[PDB]
Design a protein around this nucleic acid. Structure first.
Lengths: 363, 414, 253, 59, 162, 469
RNA sequence: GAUCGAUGUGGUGACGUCGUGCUCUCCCGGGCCGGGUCCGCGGACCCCGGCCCGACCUCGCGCGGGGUCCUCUGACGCGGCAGACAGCCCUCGCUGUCGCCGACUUGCGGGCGGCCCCCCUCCGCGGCGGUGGGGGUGCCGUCCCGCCGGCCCGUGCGUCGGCUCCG
């Protein structure tokens, strides 16, 4: 009565609060696994690498008990920094919210806790992102919440005469018109930050934390927000609840185009200008690959899945493919994966013992 | 916990057999120190003063009330004596006697309402015996001036006076030796005559007058095999005395004539209680089975109502009751109504109303047996007056409280 | 040095001792080269023995629950710390059957525990009156010989855990060791006074008071070790309480 | 016979405690069956003398 | 035993950030006792600091802060900040002192030194402490409901042997 | 997997009272008092393994050992008074001073001085050896400082560059002929190198009582009045840090065995211990009288302080693996706390009883609060709290009374109070003690609410004065 | 009431802490100052306001001093120890082990290892580490000979005091 082997692929969980992420060090899929754990899973072979425990507390399967839930996670400068968000909601009046910073110690080869903040916000955190610019002198983390505030944390020297150490300290607090902050994003350079306050989007300068612009299209609240990459970095893309996808030009401070498309999953390719959108039609999900510069699709696919697609991700492929046609070119830079409601992961494919002699087993 | 082990064959074809545990039972909360195996039942006795008979379903030939679970906690005999005139209650323990006086109330209410009282229940007398021997029986005079109680070796009678709001006890100087072991002590309606039943078959009549005793007459042992302990009933006129405890049957003697009057025809089940009507002079007799008889002392025959009940037969819900009848009461104002009670129920029966049958329902949580279960554990009840009743009751949890400590058990939720 | 044993099928000798190392050596008369040595952290070896097939090494320690199994063919060291259904606190005394299908563990309150060799799971238990001093397996591995603390020896059946016979060793207040021959002809019992009694195996099975073939009175202090020659011509007796207390016995004579 | 079934080393509780386990699982929670304790109120001075040293270490 | 769960190390060297600490957010008269107060602030002697500070008379505090030297109000601010963390019995007097100093003497004055970070710590501490008001009100309501709910034998006879 | 112990919540405290320096500076035993006649001007330890200290007072220089209430030796042949007894680096000779002006060399085993120097005309108060153990530097009240040779018994050199009483001299162990002198003329001059004039001078705002040299880095610390000033020699006359933490004159300044610790004694019955790296106070010592002399033994073993009055205070403090063997590591058993063992086997009531132990409640209330939080997390707090008599609930009420007002423990204890109020409502009237405990809890509740309302008013005022700027 | 097919309603492993328990219980504190409340000036009660507070006798003048001890809630196990040539198993054993209050549970040594405080190589799918070298006052654990032991005399000793062991 002891475990000798475990056969498991992707962990099945009731709710996947975090998105589908990739650990930069292992190039492995990171998502929600066991309750209180993050599953690291190998994509090439259907084998689970391991589970990483964030909250080290006992779990009881008794019914009708509120359980601490790991809602958001993020990887910072390469894989060095990991930010985890946990919460307990027993009653609507009081919320327990806790945020943890883990620094990867390469001597140990594991993560170690650096900073723990209890009640960073008064309400649920909705967004969590890092500055992956490498031209910003200090790492920066931004947390947005429904309370109407977004807080900017920076890594500062915490050394004393007794001990030498580094830690995270609060840098900036921002709010606009007493509105719930829904999404936040960084530019390709990290010089500007785009944060969504319900229907409106505000653009701030990250260097001096001064507001730079405000876009308010009277369509609906913003579900998804992203920046353009590479030659389309000047563009910003925003999807509303009322089925409108609109592209703003930061240089012109005006919208270039808008379209009637209700999208649930929108992911920017890190190594390409392509944007892939998953629209939930009644018959099934549909995939649209386009570029922010041109308002027409580059590739359209229908009937990718009968079931609703809840998350999507782009993974950089090591050896780039070669497809000359513009419809098939988006497959060159990176591979696309998507996870549906039934937790099924789908993608697009175009195709010793020396004793044997010492003990005389040979006779 | 009581565990049953059975010998079972390993397989049908093989003749080899193995011992396995099959049935656990939890009818006790304390130590179970002794068990017995009947051919069809398991008997268990524990220090929680419960006697449990559990028949086994696989070993009973017929399915009926005999296969039902049986639990015995309460005694089968009356331990409380009542003096109606002076509102006095006497309680019998192993080594001492307690005497209380009831408290009256002046408030009036309707339906179920708690009336505030004027004077509380008051504990008068606490008399302790000498020696290790236990009390067999005790009795109070209806007037309230005489207390009698017996042990295996000595008989004690006391004259008590209620003077200056103070109780005073005086022991009689001498008593005869043949009263040393009384099975039953009974006082007549007047303080003049005392009736004593001896351990061996004998009856003794004693004249009590001014603190003076005279042994009038000794009734000879009743013929027949002794089947149960004697029970004594005195008629309210004082003319007749009814005694039981033999296979011959209940014998009724004329006290004034000092000779036997009649003998009730014998019933195989033992007698549990007897009582005598005030004016009609009718003896009601209850047995171990729930059947009841009524017999006319002057007519020397069964009454017409008793014949009607015996021909019709009792209700089957009445018959299927574990506890026996421990006390029966009459009232002179109402001859038609007879009161009786058991441990878990009490009945008032009207002879004029038509008898119930199996189709009708006996008790609902016209109809002859008006039976109620409001006072769940009943140790005593009596008709104090024509609207006044006294009911002495003992909750089980109070008995559990005064018990030796049990073994610790781990519970799920705690 | 707690234990020394020769490998059944190869010229390999294994030496284990109070120092936590277990070593295997190439058996050569001149040099005896070292093959491999393994050091455990806090495990002073009370007894180490080879398996009947010789493929794995089993070791135990003084006042330690875990039993160490070293599989040489697979190169795996499996510590058996938990045996399901076993209430024993520490495991120090144990024996292995010649055929290799059973392992016997000496316990407390006169309890003998039988375990399967391949899976290390408990099969059943045998209880004797008094303490268990020593135990051994029969040549055919169908019976168990157990010597009690009052000088009485019990015979148990392996397949059905029943006591076949109970005989008494002559003039033994308490026994310390017991051994059996490979051919099944001799059974030897050691006692406190240093007297070793040799019996026919048939005599032990059928007689409550067997008469030994010969009682060896040469040793004067309590015999703790008994070992039979594979050809059944030499019996080696020893006592650890005195120096130079080892003798060799010619079995037929 | 007393020490065998009620002596040190046995697993015994109080009758108040044993009946109080049911109250901890009722749909409406209740207190102990016998709430008042006579031994608590009567003793006020003996506690101070014996445990005079203990409170020093805690502070 | 094969379990595919890895545990990061959580030790006591990690920094904890609660909302109450800075890193979470962002003519001969006895009418006054000024020189006693400044002597107490120079050397942190608990006794005479209590004697000067643990008072209730409002005009005493007014005249004490009015006659107070101007370059030592900041040590007063640290001492009040230290002493506000406690049972309300001593803390209410300290709140009265803080109101008195902040109200009349330095309403115009405090804007000049521009030393807002020093009082910012007290600001965050006060905001952290005032969080449980509605829960305390609920507890008080149930306590008031609770308080509303709040408001032998004469003769023993032993027989003698005979 | 394996069982996980309950998390123990830690709450930071604004004060930094608990420090490793605090543990290192409070290890010491009770002070011991030695009676003497006259003020103790200074106390000096000897660096030899038999560490002893010389206390100079009035006309007597006493040599005391460790413990040893009575002096082990006494030099009393001083005509009026003695000044500045100091040991040599070899612990065999000691320099002394007198109001006559003669500098006296004494052997630690003799009775009469070995060498007498008669150059000074008035009282001499500071004398010290050099880096080499055969020259001495002395300074007197006749405004001059003189360098003397011990074997030659004549004065090597004289300096006259001071305007008041010269009464504090120090020398450098690293470099011979490099010495620093202090006077009441507010200036500290460094007579050094091989030259006939001072190379560097330093200005202090008050008369200089004490000066000391840090051996490494060329840092000079000077005490004047309340001020203690640090000057750097890497660039001449550079005041790095000037500090004041005393409310009277700083009398003496001493250096610990470790370079990081610096001790300053003053006239106001307080001694401050600083770290040199941060130049901030790390410890304080309080004494019965003013500290005239402060002295430290090897490491920080013994602290000696000499007062204005005669008495002075002394403060004391099997087989192994062979190389060729292969190593196998056995797991080490992990020990769970008793409440963790109860929670592992679901003894919620027993765990609550354990954490309600008065020792646990007093020493570590945080553990009890964390266990109550864990019971609330499991949803079995009501089960554990219910089913108890007056005695058991009274201790819970006492703990709540003592700990409800605390801001760190407020929410969970408020919830526990809610639960016990809901459960124990019907049985209230029987017991007076539970009534008293409920009344105390109630009263604490109103006073906390009034406190918070006052806090809200002050919050509004602070909001105003913040938004002004 | 119970009740004649009845079934205790139901909670989570493991590897020498060779001083400790999922065991049951004892208490919920006292004496002072700075205050603040309430009640009828008086009293009573509260304070992450600060203070202190071992038992036991004795002498002198209830007071004060002096000493003695001073490890602390009691049982019950567990572990250890002590007794058989044998015992994790046995005991009305002892909870350091013994003398008859005291000796003892050391002492100095030698030797090895483990890790770190910093600067100079070599390798890293190179963010940062290992791999080599050094220096840091650098602190530690274990292993044996220690000062072979055991009896009997003689007078701390007993030039070859004896018999035995150890070596």
């Amino acid at each position: 009565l002891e475990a000798s082997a475990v056969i498991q692929g992707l962990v099945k969980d009731r709710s996947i609060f975090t998105g589908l992420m990739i650990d930069p060090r292992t190039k492995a899929l990171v998502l929600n696994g066991k309750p209180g754990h993050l599953q690291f899973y190998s994509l090439q072979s259907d084998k689970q690498l391991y589970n990483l425990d964030i909250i080290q507390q006992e779990y009881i399967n008794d019914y009708g008990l509120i359980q601490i839930e790991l809602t958001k996670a993020a990887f910072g400068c390469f894989g060095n920094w990991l930010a985890t968000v946990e919460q307990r909601q027993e009653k609507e009046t009081e919320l327990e919210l806790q945020m943890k910073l883990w620094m990867y110690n390469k001597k140990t080869q594991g993560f170690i806790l650096n900073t723990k903040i209890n009640m960073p916000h008064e309400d649920c955190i909705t967004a969590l992102c890092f500055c992956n610019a490498e031209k910003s002198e200090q790492p920066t983390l931004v947390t947005a919440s429904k309370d109407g505030y977004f807080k900017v944390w920076i890594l500062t020297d915490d050394s004393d005469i007794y001990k030498k150490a580094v830690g995270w300290t609060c840098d900036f607090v921002g709010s606009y018109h007493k509105y719930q902050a829904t999404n936040c994003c960084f530019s390709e350079d990290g010089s500007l930050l785009a944060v969504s306050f319900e229907e409106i989007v505000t653009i701030w300068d990250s260097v001096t934390w001064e507001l730079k612009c405000t876009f308010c299209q009277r369509a609906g609240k913003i579900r998804h927000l992203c920046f353009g990459r590479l030659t389309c970095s000047k563009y910003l893309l925003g999807a509303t609840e009322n089925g409108i996808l609109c592209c703003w030009n930061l240089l012109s401070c005006a919208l270039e185009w808008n379209a009637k498309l209700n999208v649930r999953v929108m992911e920017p390719d890190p190594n390409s200008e392509n944007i892939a959108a998953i629209s939930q039609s009644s018959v099934g999900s549909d995939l649209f690959v386009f570029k922010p510069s041109e308002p027409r699709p580059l590739y359209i696919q229908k009937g990718i899945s009968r079931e609703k697609v809840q998350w999507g991700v782009f993974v950089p492929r090591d050896v780039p493919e070669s497809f000359t046609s513009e419809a098939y070119q988006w497959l060159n830079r990176s591979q696309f994966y998507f996870l549906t409601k039934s937790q099924s992961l789908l993608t697009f494919s175009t195709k010793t013992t020396p004793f044997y002699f010492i003990l005389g087993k040979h006779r | 916990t009581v565990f049953h082990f059975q010998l079972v064959p390993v397989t049908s074809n093989s003749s080899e057999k193995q011992w396995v545990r099959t049935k656990p039972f939890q009818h006790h909360t304390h130590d179970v120190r002794t068990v017995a195996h009947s051919p069809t039942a398991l008997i268990s006795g524990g220090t929680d003063t419960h006697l449990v008979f559990r028949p086994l379903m696989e070993k009973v030939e017929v399915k009926n009330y005999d296969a039902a679970l049986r639990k015995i906690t309460f005694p089968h005999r009356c331990l409380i004596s009542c003096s109606k005139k002076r509102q006095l209650l006497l309680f019998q323990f192993a080594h001492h006697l307690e005497l209380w006086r009831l408290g009256s109330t002046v408030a009036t209410g309707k339906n179920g309402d708690t009336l505030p009282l004027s004077k509380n229940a008051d504990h008068l007398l606490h008399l302790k015996t000498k020696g290790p021997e236990n009390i067999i029986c005790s009795c109070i005079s209806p007037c309230g001036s005489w207390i009698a109680y017996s042990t295996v070796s000595r008989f004690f009678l006391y004259r008590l006076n209620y003077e200056h709001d103070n109780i005073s006890l005086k022991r009689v100087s001498k008593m005869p030796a043949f009263l040393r072991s009384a099975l039953q002590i009974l006082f007549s309606e007047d303080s003049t005559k005392l009736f004593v039943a001896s351990n061996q078959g004998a009856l003794h009549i004693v004249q009590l007058s001014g603190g003076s005793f005279k042994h009038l007459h000794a009734f000879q042992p009743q013929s027949g095999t002794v089947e149960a302990m004697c029970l004594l009933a005195v008629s309210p006129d004082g003319n007749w005395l009814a005694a039981s405890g033999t296979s011959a049957g209940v014998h009724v003697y004329n006290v004034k004539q000092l000779k036997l009057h009649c003998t009730v025809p014998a019933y195989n089940f033992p007698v549990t209680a007897m009582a005598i009507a005030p004016n009609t002079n009718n003896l009601v007799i209850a047995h171990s089975d729930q059947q009841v008889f009524e017999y006319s002392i002057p007519d020397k025959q069964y009454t017409d109502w008793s014949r009607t009940v015996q021909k019709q037969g009792f209700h089957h819900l009445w018959l299927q009751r574990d506890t026996p009848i421990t006390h029966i009461s009459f009232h002179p104002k109402r001859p038609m109504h007879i009161l009786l009670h058991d441990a878990y129920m009490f009945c008032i029966i009207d002879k004029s109303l038509p008898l119930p049958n199996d189709k009708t329902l006996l008790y609902n949580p016209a109809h002859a047996f008006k039976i109620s279960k409001i006072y769940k554990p009943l140790l005593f009840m009596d008709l104090l007056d024509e609207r006044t009743l006294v009911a002495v009751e003992r909750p089980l949890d109070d008995i559990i409280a005064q018990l030796p400590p049990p073994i610790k058990k781990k519970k799920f939720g705690t | 040095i707690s234990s020394v044993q020769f490998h059944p099928g190869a010229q390999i000798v294994m030496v284990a001792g109070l120092d936590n190392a277990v070593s295997l050596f190439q058996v050569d008369g001149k040099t005896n080269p070292k093959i491999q040595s393994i050091y455990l952290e806090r495990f002073p070896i009370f007894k180490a023995c080879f398996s009947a097939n010789g493929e794995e090494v089993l070791a135990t320690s003084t006042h330690s629950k875990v039993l160490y199994v070293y599989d040489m063919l697979a190169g795996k060291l499996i510590p058996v710390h938990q045996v399901r259904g076993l209430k024993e606190k520490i495991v120090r005394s144990f024996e292995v059957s010649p055929d290799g299908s059973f392992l016997l563990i000496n316990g407390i309150a006169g309890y003998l525990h039988l375990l399967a060799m391949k899976t290390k799971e408990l099969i059943g238990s045998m209880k004797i009156n008094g303490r268990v001093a020593a135990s051994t397996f029969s040549s055919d591995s169908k019976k168990v010989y157990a010597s009690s603390g009052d000088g009485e020896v019990y015979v148990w059946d392996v397949n059905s855990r029943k006591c076949l016979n109970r005989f008494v060793d002559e003039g033994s207040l308490y026994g310390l060791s017991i051994a059996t021959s490979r051919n099944g002809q001799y059974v030897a019992c050691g006692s406190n006074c240093g007297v070793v009694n040799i019996y026919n195996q048939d005599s032990c099975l059928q007689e409550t008071n067997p008469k030994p073939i010969k009682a060896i009175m040469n040793l004067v202090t309590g015999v703790t070790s008994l070992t039979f020659n594979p050809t059944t011509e030499i019996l080696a007796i020893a006592s650890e309480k005195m120096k130079e207390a080892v003798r060799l016995v010619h079995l037929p004579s | 016979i007393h020490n065998s079934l009620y002596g040190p080393g046995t697993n015994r509780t109080t009758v108040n405690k044993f009946l109080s386990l049911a109250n901890k699982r009722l749909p409406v929670k209740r207190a102990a069956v016998q709430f008042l304790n006579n031994a608590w109120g009567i003793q006020k001075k003996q506690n101070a003398k014996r445990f005079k040293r203990r409170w020093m270490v805690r502070k | 035993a094969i379990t595919k769960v890895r545990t990061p190390v959580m030790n006591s060297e990690a920094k904890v950030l609660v909302p109450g600490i800075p890193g979470h957010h962002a003519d001969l008269q006895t009418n006054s006792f000024p020189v006693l107060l400044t002597q107490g602030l120079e050397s942190n002697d608990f006794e005479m600091l209590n004697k000067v500070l643990q008072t209730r008379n409002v005009n005493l505090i007014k005249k004490t802060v009015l006659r107070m030297p101007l370059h030592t109000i900041i040590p007063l601010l640290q001492e009040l900040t230290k002493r506000l963390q406690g049972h309300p019995n001593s803390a209410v007097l300290m709140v009265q002192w803080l109101k008195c100093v902040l109200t009349v003497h330095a309403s115009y004055l405090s804007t000049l030194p521009d030393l807002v970070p020093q009082l910012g710590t007290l600001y965050q501490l006060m905001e952290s402490r005032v969080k449980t008001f509605q829960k305390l009100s609920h507890l008080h309501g149930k306590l008031i409901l609770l308080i509303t709910q709040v408001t032998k034998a004469k003769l023993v006879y032993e027989e003698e042997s005979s | 997997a394996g069982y996980k112990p309950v998390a123990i919540q830690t709450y930071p405290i604004l004060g930094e009272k608990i420090t490793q320096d605090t543990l290192y500076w409070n290890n010491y035993k009770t002070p011991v008092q030695i009676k003497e006649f006259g003020a103790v001007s200074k106390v000096d330890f000897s660096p030899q393994p038999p560490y002893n200290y010389a206390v100079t007072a009035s006309s007597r220089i006493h040599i005391y050992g460790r413990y040893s209430q009575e002096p082990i030796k006494t030099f009393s042949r001083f005509k009026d008074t003695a000044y500045c007894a100091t040991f040599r680096q070899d612990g065999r000779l000691l320099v002394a001073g007198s109001e006559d002006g003669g500098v006296q060399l004494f052997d630690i085993s003799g009775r009469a001085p070995l060498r007498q120097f008669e150059g000074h005309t008035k009282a001499v108060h500071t004398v010290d050896f050099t880096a080499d153990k055969y020259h001495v530097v002395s300074g007197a009240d006749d405004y001059t400082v003189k360098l003397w040779d011990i074997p030659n018994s004549k004065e090597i050199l004289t300096f006259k560059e001071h305007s008041d009483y010269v009464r504090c001299g120090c020398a450098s162990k690293l470099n011979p002929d490099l010495f620093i002198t202090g006077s009441y003329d507010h200036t500290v001059k460094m007579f050094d190198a091989r030259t006939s004039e001072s190379v560097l001078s330093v200005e202090h705002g008050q008369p200089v009582e004490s000066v000391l040299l840090f051996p490494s880095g060329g840092l000079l610390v000077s005490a004047g009045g309340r001020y203690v000033k640090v000057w750097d020699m890497l660039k001449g006359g550079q005041l790095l840090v000037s500090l004041k933490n005393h409310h009277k004159t700083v009398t003496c300044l001493c250096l610990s065995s470790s370079g990081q610790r610096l001790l300053s004694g003053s006239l106001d019955r307080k001694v401050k211990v600083y770290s040199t790296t941060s130049y901030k106070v790390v410890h304080s010592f309080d004494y019965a009288a003013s500290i005239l002399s402060l002295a430290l033994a090897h490491e920080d073993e013994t602290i000696v302080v000499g007062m204005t009055n005669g008495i002075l205070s002394v403060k004391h403090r099997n087989y192994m693996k062979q190389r060729d063997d292969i190593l196998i590591n056995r797991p080490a058993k992990k020990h769970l706390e008793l409440y963790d063992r109860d929670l592992k086997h679901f003894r919620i009531s027993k765990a609550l009883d354990r954490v309600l132990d008065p020792t646990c409640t007093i020493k570590t209330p945080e553990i009890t609060v964390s266990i109550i939080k864990e019971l609330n997390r499991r949803g079995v707090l009501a089960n554990a709290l219910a089913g108890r008599d007056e005695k058991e609930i009274s201790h819970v009420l006492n703990f709540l009374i003592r700990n409800l007002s605390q801001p760190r423990f407020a929410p969970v204890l408020i919830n526990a109070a809610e639960i016990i109020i809901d459960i124990y409502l019907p049985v209230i009237g029987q017991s007076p003690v539970v009534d008293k405990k409920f009344l105390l809890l109630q009263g604490l509740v109103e006073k906390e609410i009034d406190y918070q309302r006052e806090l809200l008013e002050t919050l509004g005022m602070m909001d105003m004065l913040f938004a002004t700027m």
